[PDB]
Design a protein around this ligand. Structure first.
Ligand SMILES: O=C(O)[C@H](O)[C@@H](O)[C@H](O)[C@H](O)COP(=O)(O)O
Ligand SMILES: O=C(O)[C@H](O)[C@@H](O)[C@H](O)[C@H](O)COP(=O)(O)O
Lengths: 557, 557
């Protein structure tokens, strides 16, 4: 047994679910209570736009929410939160603080690690980033032939890739006057090859993004970039004009051959999947300008303050977390879908697929005991409206329960045709959650079949296929506009959702020991692939696949 | 109850699972039997490359596979397949044939629908596509000001978008000397707006891809494109040089104002999510050339013939389907991950997320019974190695069982640094499935921590976190090279896997009444967004969300 399952508030919740959950029907919940939306939503005013978190289309009553809040309290969420914010070493397996909140601490109130305020160094690096952004964006920073930089290439993977990629994509309209940004991440040589093919060494600046500065994919990609660069420049001293580093590892940055003044530092208490707020966000700041980067940080700071100050029962990330606990630990739902009705947000789901799954895909608790309950869900999704044509069939008429978060800005960045496209986009956003809740009754579908001129036989056969059970719960998250500030608040909101769930499960949201085995085994296989000799050192499958590779790699097609 | 659960071969399978599955341990299965790879893999020689389907790292024995094959026979898979290939109207809810196999029927053996061979019309459209491709790609086809076409823009959604998108991405190296290709799909105005900003009306050719030619997103996007075009051209006759249609609806194509000689026809028996093989594939053929499109079709034809003629026990799509049934209906796994170790394949998982989930996300059977068992899984994934740094933490050390298909070409399109990148990519591909299979025992992790220099205290604290339980099953699908032919074979293989699972569940893989519902939903909300008036006609959530939209849409940020 584990902390969560031994908790009496959890036991009460589970027993309530067993006895009563069959009585929960969304249609009836709304019919019984005209104040339902009012009581089961949060309209947050940030002073820079509103964020409406509408959780009313969920399979919860007032009683269920009360039990969930009581569980958050009795799992120590409030104390755990305060410990994060104060610099306690809550990443217990690595003995590190967890301080992405410090990166965006706009108030500059001291946050101490080992008795020392981290804010001076946070701000020093931010100042460095700002200066660098001015130099590059103005054209003052020259390439080896004296030309202004037109292209920036981030080289990094996972935490050193997805954040900057997702954010630059989401904030594309804010990039006027900024250099083009490219993201190279996969070791697959296709990635760097196709990127370099469209670039000039004279006007391209590479950003080597790596906490450790030892990740194989990133260092290999970086060395490939440098080789390509030096082929043209034929001068090792020119590297300082075209390569900068975002890292915690001064020594390995120097060994690679980058100028010490070209290093933008971060700290061990910045987790990779929580790092876009640090030096790692340099490509964001370059692309959209430092002012917009500061706005992004400020939005996160607003949400941090909301999370810190707000009673749990009306605390947005807490409520989202609690709904997830309900669906995961009581209903047994494996997945959570993120469905932004926004093309600019097209990498948002992929970002939180990392942020969520790498954080909470854990099975060992703080005491060292194995969990005897579910932890993190599989996170997935694609932007609306496309999903409606693609996998919503399964959401509407399959055999899985799938909690979905639908997200949309009220105002579009592109109000073409006098807002026609956005009107339609909004209408779909609204209609889909409504339909997921309501479904379609036999009496409704029957009349439709009759009106279509179906024979009595055809109607009878078709009817069950046209009926939708509904009762599919959703969150609707609606915000004034997707500005840098609002985007920052939204990312931070989900960061804190993930944190609350982790605390409740008694797991460490901030380590990632599960990547180690794959890395070890790959290092062993790498040298074995070279040459013609048979590999027999593994299981028959691994050996068999290697044999196939060696046999097939010289075939001409 | 339903056909599957009433089936005695299924109940035998399930009973065996209950009694025996806990005793299946992958590490031990491989140690006990050096022939395991040999007995649980298929090395397919297509004469244009090999496809190795290695299913040996699955939680199966000879006996499990025997029971699964017997179940497939009991469920009448072979007869159902033959019926699909013969043009029987197996899409029973829409009374339609299901004949994507006819689209790529290179043999030209007659396939009849309603007594009439479909092949002459299939080939007539293919010939038209070929002629059009030559004219555009050669530069002969001129725009309204007399310039060659430089950009092609597919406008379509769902089945009319994702296939052409995924395939042109996957076959990018084959696009030298072809026009740039763009995909516009979302109604979100951002999609068309950002596309048009990069284009000239003089040199852009639009492809309106829509089976019905009534889909709201597509027709709206098309009308927006046409307005933009006509603002520049100022001549309705110029539309014929810049707009073509891929459709079954001649009348609606004419209504939109497209030249009848600019219409590339397909048929009702071509499902949208099975349509890239038809006229819908025109953007593929324009981008990579008709010869490469023909190779794509040929590869699918090879796999069709494999599916049609091979005994079930050695039939690749059947075996993949059966392994899925094992994990879905016996283990209860909600999801299936597709993990291609290939950047060009970056939209492959998204494509089959649609192909699989829209096909098999169903709950009514052929008999009209509601299923009392699971149907289609949630399909998801991202290319390796990035996934290793995003969500593999959860796959390795979470609380979910997740069947994964790992896919890779032996030969890379970009053998940079003398093959160094691809070597590392292959090493990771192999290591990850080995790691998922093997895990790491407490005693193995203990020895590692001891050797690392950890104190008895630090070791004990860290130990449980370093343990990998393993026993996580995978498929490895390795192919000589990702050519058009091999890609075609791989897509068809998964199409047929989906088909087999559908037959076994007794559902219609080929309708989409949930998607049809969708296309009926937003029309009611649309007029309610106009004006400042409060909406009280829906449930309080829909009402409240509409109120928020109206309150927030004029705010200046
Ligand atoms: O924080 C994380 O999400 C993980 O630790 C991981 O995804 C990490 O970010 C990458 O492996 C890049 O690591 P480096 O920044 O050290 O190159
Ligand atoms: O076949 C499918 O998978 C679905 O029917 C759906 O995804 C369809 O492709 C789109 O709604 C576009 O429909 P049109 O091609 O008619 O515009």
């Amino acid at each position: 047994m584990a902390a969560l399952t031994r908790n009496p508030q959890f036991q009460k919740l589970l027993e309530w679910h067993r006895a009563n959950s069959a009585n929960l029907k969304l249609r009836e919940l709304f019919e019984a209570d005209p104040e339902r939306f009012n009581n089961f939503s949060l309209n947050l005013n940030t002073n820079h736009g509103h964020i409406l978190v509408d959780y009313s289309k969920n399979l919860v009553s007032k009683e269920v929410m009360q039990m969930l809040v009581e569980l958050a309290k009795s799992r120590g969420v409030e104390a755990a939160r305060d410990n994060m914010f104060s610099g306690s070493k809550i990443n217990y397996t690595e003995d590190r603080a967890v301080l992405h909140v410090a990166l965006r601490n706009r108030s500059n109130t001291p946050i101490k690690v080992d008795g020392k305020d981290v804010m001076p160094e946070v701000n020093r690096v931010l100042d460095k980033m700002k200066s660098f952004c001015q130099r590059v964006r103005s054209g003052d920073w020259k390439g080896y032939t004296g030309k202004s930089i037109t292209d920036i290439i981030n080289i990094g993977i996972g935490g050193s890739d997805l954040g900057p990629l997702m954010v630059t994509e989401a904030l594309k309209p804010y990039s006027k006057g900024g250099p083009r940004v490219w993201f190279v991440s996969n070791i697959d040589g296709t990635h760097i090859a196709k990127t370099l093919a469209s670039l000039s060494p004279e006007t391209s600046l590479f950003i080597i993004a790596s906490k450790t500065f030892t990740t194989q994919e990133t260092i290999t990609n970086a060395e490939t970039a440098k080789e390509w660069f030096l082929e043209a420049a034929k001068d090792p001293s020119a590297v300082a004009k075209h390569f900068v580093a975002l890292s915690t590892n001064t020594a390995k940055v120097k060994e690679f051959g980058i100028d010490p003044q070209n290093m933008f530092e971060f700290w061990d208490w910045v987790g990779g999947r929580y790092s876009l707020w640090s030096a790692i966000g340099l490509s964001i700041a370059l692309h959209v300008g430092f002012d917009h980067f500061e706005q992004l940080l400020s939005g996160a700071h607003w949400m941090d303050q909301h999370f810190l100050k707000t009673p749990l029962e009306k605390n947005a990330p807490v409520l989202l977390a609690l709904l997830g606990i309900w669906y995961i630990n009581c209903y047994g739902c494996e997945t959570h879908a993120l469905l932004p009705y926004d093309q600019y947000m097209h990498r948002f789901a992929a970002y939180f697929q990392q942020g969520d799954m790498e954080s909470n895909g854990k099975y060992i608790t703080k005491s060292g005991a194995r969990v005897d309950h579910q932890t993190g869900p599989i996170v997935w999704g694609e932007p609306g409206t496309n999903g409606q044509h693609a996998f919503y069939q399964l959401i509407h008429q399959g055999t899985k329960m799938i909690p979905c978060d639908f997200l949309i800005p009220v105002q579009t960045q592109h109000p073409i045709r006098k807002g026609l496209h956005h009107k339609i986009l909004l209408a779909n956003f609204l209609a889909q959650t409504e339909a997921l809740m309501k479904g379609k009754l036999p009496e409704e579908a029957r009349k439709e079949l009759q009106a279509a001129g179906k024979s009595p036989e055809d109607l009878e056969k078709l009817l069950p296929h046209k009926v939708f059970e509904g009762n599919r719960p959703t969150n609707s998250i609606v915000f004034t506009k997707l500005t840098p500030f609002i985007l920052g608040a939204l990312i931070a909101m989900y960061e804190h959702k993930i944190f609350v769930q982790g605390i409740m499960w008694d797991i460490n949201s901030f380590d990632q020991w599960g990547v180690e085995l794959g890395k070890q085994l790959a290092k062993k296989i790498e040298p074995e692939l070279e040459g013609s000799s048979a590999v027999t050192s593994h299981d028959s499958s691994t050996n068999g696949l290697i044999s196939f590779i060696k046999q097939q790699r010289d075939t001409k097609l």
